[PDB]
Design a protein around this nucleic acid. Structure first.
Ligand code: NAD
Ligand code: NAD
Ligand code: NAD
Ligand code: NAD
Ligand code: SAH
Ligand code: CDP
Lengths: 384, 295, 255, 255, 255, 255
RNA sequence: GGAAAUAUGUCUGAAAGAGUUACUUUGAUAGAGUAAAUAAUAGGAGCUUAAACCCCCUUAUUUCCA
């Protein structure tokens, strides 16, 4: 690409070797243009500063310079480059940096000419869809625990079938599960989301529960897997949200609250889990009612913001009512016509009475199927 | 006229529930292009008129109470009120005002200067301007009623500026009789650059002990839309030493807005000047901002 | 010291007179509270002890003062010191134009009678009583002290009658001091300023705070014990005579 | 000049009051001799011409002073100046050990009534009368002057009652000056020394001659014309107020 | 009238002295201005007319005052009146604990020298010239008038040196009056309060306005013409002597 | 009581200062005599005891007073009282026509420097050390007494300079009392009359006996112990301030 | 970086209290009387109004990111 050529020119000017690294290299080897592009450079951060100053390309320090990570905007395109390093010690050698890598699937570094330089047979691992750790897998696990989750995500994303797990890897993960508790909860939450939105999610979740990672991560020891399995099947191909599946696994709202407090995830997901747990037990479609979607429509009308509309849509996804979910998508919350002024014209001044009458008219409007008109409501309004 | 019809439409829509029509506020509506912003103006305008109605009701109630008190006195008819044994006439308000005036004159002759620089007009809106004027009035009152009043200077005050006009309107004829020095010239001209200390909440220097041989300059500024560094910027431009109160040192400030109102600042400074310790001086900080005194 | 003396304190049942009586009795002297029968001086006289005795009399009444002084002589046998701390205060503007109100003459007359005429009557009668005594080593037969006011020097608005009475006391101080010089009696005046007493303490809290703030130093209403101590000092010193001491605290009354 | 001013002079039938009336009438003013009925003031008022009108009154009596002020208002239509020159003197020691004689209370009371109470009564009633005057250019509605001997400051033996009354006048001069300030009336006090007048002449002539010789300079008894001139100066000066001026001749009354 | 009098006025090139010279010269008298050579009083002397002559001199300098008096004698051959209206004012607290500032001794010494020592030097020197005069029929050879301040009685804060000087003038008023009484020279003191003059220029305008508002009546700064009129009245009256006249407008200075 | 107080007495070598020092030291206080080196005050300091020390100084000179105050602070650490009794008297007539002799300005200047300038210098210099003291109960840091004279009020012939100095002291009394009131220092003044001291003994014996007979009562010359007692009374009393006290004995100076 | 928190310009606080300024020479409750300022609570938006709330954007502080 043009940006790639500009980056090659800039780094040749710097004279320090550069190679795409990681997911970008994996995607290129897959034959798909990489969605994310990551570069590794032999240059030290001081050399990066010098060459950027001598180049004039606008600079971005995203706080990653602790590991040599910097961004430069060439032709309005941001290129992210990290200094090659070993486990922060910078290394110009590509083999040593690849050894520092976690998984072979990302160890290889591609030359800008299009030629790969793999030092641990990672490319063949990708071609075979197998997963191989850089050097000693157990040592890599010892290095970092969150990596367990990285390996799980890579397996779900890459491996074509479930159950293709290395027993050595599984036992090492089970042994090292103790360390996973210490790692920061954000990264845990991000990796969990990524795994959930991935393939083999049911099998991966079952394996994780078998590994007993939940106590270290704070997930409940016992979960309604069967319910989770049904929910996954229903939402399979329906863009499920990870919190939806987690709630399906969850049984009580307050456990989800504690899990959020541990992870410190956005309050939006907190509400997600809360009302999901509440409604899956409480709110259900009314087949006896002409419209089984009518209870959900009324509940949405009761709520304030369209966020509740999306929330009920996610609840429908959880329940698997694909037809009802579609109808909700096409269905739009009709506006309640009567305003407080109509009531004031009718001859009501007490504000609290106005609100009570508005609520009553809302229930009557819902009962009428929303077909009742504003003047019909006014006739319904009892002068007082 | 069109404003009148719009106000009637508001009454029908009952937002701000306008009740009475006035020429000045009507022409303000005509001038106030933004009706979205005007919603709050009309809301607190109607609140003002209600408050006037409630004031009339309360005045009726208080007149009834005064009639009750006077007829109670009439029925009691005790007579021999202290056997008519008084030593002074009941003219205490006048005597208090006169004593305050004498103290103010003495201070103006031999008082420690304290400067308010009204050079922030360009950084304030109408509401902020009114708040600044009210705070200045309160601060001047607190200084006046003290036992060791400051000699208050009003520097950078434009003769016809917005602040000057508002202050004159608020003080009526008292403005000319006030015992404070109001001058066009900036504080730098009046005093040597050495003695001036420009108080501000941004300066790295931390005020430790009140110094009686220094002129403390307080920025007569109200900053609703946070603009950090304005006072510090001015002090650096004039090359004037700056200080900040030790709010963290003696209070568990934690997360809060370090800015303090002018009246709180002057009360703290007066307490410090009167040999009060830092706890007594800082008591005047709003209680909400700080949890409690440190140790 | 003042032990063994006999003091006749007019208006001694309250305020400055009571403080002076308390101090003198504590020092061992004997006192006679010459205050109105309904003031409540009998309780104070009983409280002080056998030394203090209450004699109900009205200073404006010649017969009553004669009776009180005779009682004092009978119960103690001599009169060495006299204190005139009895008086009243009336506040009223001389003439108010807006209200069309004029100062009443009865108020002026009664204030004069109680303060100035009363003080002079007590002075003459007790001067006779003292002159009946025997001279001391220095010839001082006795001491007479009169309580004037700072209002006698700078009155406030509405203090016409009070100022007139206290100024009369101030003016007659020296002439009387010269009248009794052959006898050997020393006449002195004390002009207290603002003192915490029933006259002032009865005012609102804010008024008392303001008045206390007025005094340059100390910024507190003068304690009556200070007045009693000054009276004791005047008694002890055999040279003070015909002088007005301003026990004011440096306060000059405001306009 | 003082042309057109209307003056009410108490005790204007003799001595300093008569001298002031003479001077003010000669200057073109209009006087009202306010004196006792059997005082001979009628002859003087007739002598001085149309500008004088004798007003028989007693200062100690409220009704008489009110009647006199009504007469003055009817005759001249306004009152602009007041001069309290009416008073008496008494010579009696406070106590005389050799003679066993005590000052009578009646003499003291009468002297206070005439000198002090009468002066205050006239002052208040005249202030009420002058309140109706339209303010002049400077806002001065009127002027009040009071005579109060130097005995108020340095009295002599047997001068207790006089000194008391004159000290009362001196003390009340200021608070009244403050009371009437909003109205716009200037109150002043002249403290004469020794003068040639019937009051002094009542005493032995040899002692009067000695006292006249005792004045440092001039060594003669003050002429009442000097007092009248000083009164005119006080009236003219629009800034004198609330002060006691000693028209004494530098004499300090010896013991 | 004062036609033919010769007056030596110190500090007569500005303020009160200038007004006094104006009034006396307009009345018909002749005046000699005795002010500092740089005071620019020559223009004032030219403006007043031929009856006024400016004689440069410093009151503190004995030789300069002698030269000025000799010039006055040479021009007019007589000195009947002396007026001391030359002085300076210094505002400085005795000790300011907060600032750690102590009243300088040089300021106090200068203030005393200019006011008190200057006035006494002028008095003693002009005494000889006035004594040279043939005594008038009444007896007085001449009149000496001094200027003082109400600060001599109650000086506000930061007025120690000025109050000291004026209190010295007040104290020595009477001794000099007695000293010169045998030779027929009258000494009088005027104690003005506030008067619009260059002396008040030191104070801020707002302070001056407040003080003016605080005058009981008239509520304004006294005009110099009023002081000149009072001086003329003092000169005319042959009995005023050895007295301090508070031409203050009834204002009493609070702390 | 006065136990533990430190008093700096100026001119304590002899006269009133010596009597005050003797009384205060006998009461258990500590004194610092501050008189000229040739006054022989070191012998008196030795006689008084260990509590008293002699600091040779000239009150006119700032450096001398500073050295004396530093010595007092070093010896004791506090200055809780400052008595100003140093002073000199000169009897010289302002002008003597008969002998054609004029008061020399040098004598007047010297007298002012020694009395008035000296007292103010002592006040301003000792105010700092009094301020150093932390406030006690009631917020008092020190007490400054100044010895004026009755000549400030009624001076005699040939007493112009002395009267001027004492009148200046009296005039500056109150302004200093207001200046130091915030600091918490009470300023008082005592105006003794005729006191038997080395100053008087130089005068003729006939004059001394006539003066002793001239006092109304006691008909004698005041023993300095009476001053000392009055000074102690002023010290003890916490409310006396900004006042002049006449310890004269009802004597008014002869014309 | 994305989250997650708060923000009351006199103080408490949700409307009301304590506050503030200008005048009345106050007759003993002036402990009052005429007036002034008083903005649903950081600054601007939707939703509305009885109070409102609820959310969008902007700004000031804070704890967490191979
Ligand atoms: N209180 C002050 O601040 C103050 C200030 C200056 C002067 N004074 C004067 O000091 C004196 C002390 O009085 P006080 O302040 O203690 O007030 P007070 O009322 O407590 O004392 C006055 C006393 O005089 C008595 N009395 C009144 N009229 C009497 C009469 N006709 N015959 C006999 N006894 C009579 C009263 O019963 C009372 O005991 C008074 O004359 C007062 O005017 C007081
Ligand atoms: N004579 C002096 O040297 C001298 C000195 C100082 C003060 N004074 C005062 O000066 C004033 C003038 O006295 P004088 O020297 O002219 O003597 P005077 O006797 O001639 O004056 C007194 C006048 O007052 C009048 N009078 C007295 N009582 C009166 C009353 N009750 N009502 C009305 N009129 C009354 C008398 O009739 C007489 O006309 C007196 O008040 C006196 O005390 C006089
Ligand atoms: N200004 C007031 O209101 C006021 C009040 C009370 C007393 N006084 C006294 O009145 C007097 C007049 O002052 P003023 O108000 O006219 O102010 P002023 O400054 O106009 O008068 C002072 C005059 O004294 C002259 N002068 C100063 N030092 C002199 C010297 N050493 N030798 C000769 N002439 C000298 C000046 O040149 C000037 O003409 C002063 O003594 C002042 O203290 C003034
Ligand atoms: N003696 C009286 O009857 C009488 C009366 C009224 C006032 N006074 C005043 O009272 C004070 C006491 O004086 P006294 O009667 O004891 O006479 P005194 O001479 O005995 O005392 C005066 C003292 O002042 C000292 N002194 C003078 N100049 C001094 C200087 N420059 N520095 C230091 N010390 C200095 C002298 O050495 C002496 O000790 C004097 O100020 C006197 O003027 C005295
Ligand atoms: N914590 C603090 N330290 C010092 N001065 C402060 C302060 N809080 C308020 N002030 C003073 O009070 C004034 C009004 S506060 C306005 C602050 C505004 N940001 C500015 O630029 O100043 C400030 O200008 C400052 O003078
Ligand atoms: N816990 C971790 C986190 C990151 N890493 C490595 O650090 C690299 C930094 O993340 P990145 O997003 O830049 O990686 P790529 O996009 O270049 O693959 C990852 O690719 C991992 O190989 C690790 O090994 N262990």
């Amino acid at each position: 690409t043009e940006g790639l050529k500009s980056l090659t020119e800039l780094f040749v000017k710097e004279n320090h070797e550069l190679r795409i690294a990681g997911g970008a290299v994996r995607d290129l080897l897959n034959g798909v243009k990489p969605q994310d592009i990551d570069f590794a450079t032999t240059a030290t951060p001081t050399q990066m500063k010098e060459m950027f100053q001598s180049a004039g390309i606008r600079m971005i320090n995203n706080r990653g310079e602790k590991h040599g990570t910097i961004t430069a905007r060439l032709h309005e395109e941001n290129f992210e480059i990290t200094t090659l390093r070993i486990d922060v010690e910078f290394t110009t050698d590509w083999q040593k940096d690849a050894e520092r890598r976690d998984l072979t699937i990302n160890s290889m570094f591609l030359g800008f000419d299009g030629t790969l330089f793999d030092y641990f047979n990672g490319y063949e691992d990708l071609k075979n869809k197998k997963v191989r750790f850089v050097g000693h897998a157990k040592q890599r696990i010892q290095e970092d625990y969150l990596r367990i989750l990285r390996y799980f995500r890579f397996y779900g994303r890459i491996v074509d079938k479930p159950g293709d797990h290395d027993p050595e890897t599984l036992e090492a993960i089970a042994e090292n599960a103790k360390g996973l508790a210490g790692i920061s909860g954000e990264r845990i939450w991000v990796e969990l989301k990524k795994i959930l939105v991935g393939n083999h999610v049911n099998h991966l979740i079952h394996l994780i529960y078998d590994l007993d990672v939940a106590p270290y991560i704070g997930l409940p020891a016992n979960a309604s897997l069967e319910e989770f399995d049904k929910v996954s099947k229903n939402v399979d191909g329906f863009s499920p949200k990870p919190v939806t599946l987690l709630a399906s696994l969850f049984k009580v709202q307050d456990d989800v609250t504690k899990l959020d407090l541990r992870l410190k995830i956005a309050k939006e997901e907190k509400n997600l889990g809360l009302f999901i747990v509440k409604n899956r037990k409480d709110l259900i479609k009314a087949t006896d009612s002409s419209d089984p979607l009518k209870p959900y429509q009324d509940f949405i009308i009761d709520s304030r913001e369209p966020d509740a509309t999306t929330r009920v849509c996610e609840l429908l996804k959880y329940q698997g009512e694909h037809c009802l979910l579609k109808e909700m998508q096409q269905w739009s919350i009709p506006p309640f016509p009567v305003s407080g002024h109509d009531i004031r014209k009718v001859g009501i001044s007490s504000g609290k009475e106005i609100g009570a009458l508005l609520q009553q008219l809302r229930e009557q409007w819902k009962k009428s199927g929303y077909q009742m008109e504003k003047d019909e409501l006014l006739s319904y309004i009892k002068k007082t | 006229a069109a404003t009148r019809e719009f106000i009637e439409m508001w009454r029908l829509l009952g937002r701000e529930v306008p009740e009475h029509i006035t020429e000045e506020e009507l022409k303000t509506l005509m001038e106030c292009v933004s009706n979205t912003a005007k919603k709050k103006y009309l809301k607190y305008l109607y609140t003002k008129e209600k408050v006037k109605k409630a004031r009339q009701i309360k005045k009726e109630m208080k007149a009834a109470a005064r009639e009750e008190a006077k007829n109670i006195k009439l029925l009691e008819t005790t007579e021999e009120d202290k056997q008519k044994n008084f030593l002074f006439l009941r003219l205490w308000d006048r005597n208090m005002d006169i004593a305050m005036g004498w103290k103010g004159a003495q201070a103006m002759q031999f008082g420690q200067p304290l400067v308010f620089d009204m050079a922030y007009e360009n950084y304030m809106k109408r509401k902020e301007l009114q708040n600044t004027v009210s705070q200045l009035l309160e601060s001047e009152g607190w200084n006046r009623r003290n036992v060791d009043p400051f000699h208050i200077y009003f520097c950078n005050l434009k003769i016809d500026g917005a602040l000057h006009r508002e202050l004159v309107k608020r003080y009526q004829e008292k403005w000319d009789k006030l015992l404070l020095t109001s001058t066009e010239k900036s504080h730098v001209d009046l005093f040597p650059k050495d003695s001036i200390i420009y108080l501000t909440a941004d300066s790295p220097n931390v005020m430790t002990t009140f110094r009686h041989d220094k002129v403390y300059v307080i920025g007569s500024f109200v900053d609703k839309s946070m603009q950090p560094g304005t006072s510090l910027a001015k002090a650096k431009r004039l090359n004037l030493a700056t200080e900040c109160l030790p709010l963290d040192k003696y209070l568990q400030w934690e997360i809060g807005n370090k800015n303090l109102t002018l009246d709180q600042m002057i009360r703290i400074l007066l307490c410090l000047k009167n040999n009060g310790n830092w706890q007594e001086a800082l008591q005047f900080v709003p209680k909400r901002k700080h949890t409690g005194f440190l140790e | 010291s003042v032990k063994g003396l006999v003091a006749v304190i007019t208006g001694g049942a309250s305020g400055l007179g009571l403080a002076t009586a308390e101090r003198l009795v504590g020092q061992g002297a004997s006192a006679v509270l010459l205050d109105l029968p309904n003031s409540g001086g009998e309780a104070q006289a009983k409280k002080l002890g056998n030394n203090c005795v209450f004699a109900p009399a009205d200073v404006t009444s010649e017969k009553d003062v004669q009776t009180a002084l005779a009682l004092a002589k009978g119960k103690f046998g001599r009169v060495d010191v006299a204190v005139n701390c009895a008086g009243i205060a009336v506040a009223s503007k001389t003439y108010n134009l807006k209200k069309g109100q004029t100062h009443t003459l009865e108020d002026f007359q009664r204030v004069l009678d109680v303060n100035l005429m009363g003080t002079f009557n007590v002075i003459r009668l007790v001067a006779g009583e003292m002159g009946q005594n025997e001279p001391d080593q220095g010839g001082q037969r006795g001491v007479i002290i009169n309580t004037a006011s700072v209002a006698a020097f700078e009155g406030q608005v509405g203090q016409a009658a009070y100022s007139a009475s206290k100024g009369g006391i101030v003016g007659m101080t020296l002439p009387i001091a010269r009248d009794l010089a052959p006898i050997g009696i020393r006449v002195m005046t004390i002009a207290p300023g603002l003192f915490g007493t029933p006259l002032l303490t009865s005012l609102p809290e804010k008024v008392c705070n303001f008045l206390a703030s007025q005094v340059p130093f100390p910024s507190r209403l003068g304690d009556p014990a200070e007045y009693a101590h000054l009276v004791q000092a005047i008694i002890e010193n055999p040279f003070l005579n015909g002088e007005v001491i301003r026990l004011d605290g440096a306060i000059r009354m405001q306009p």
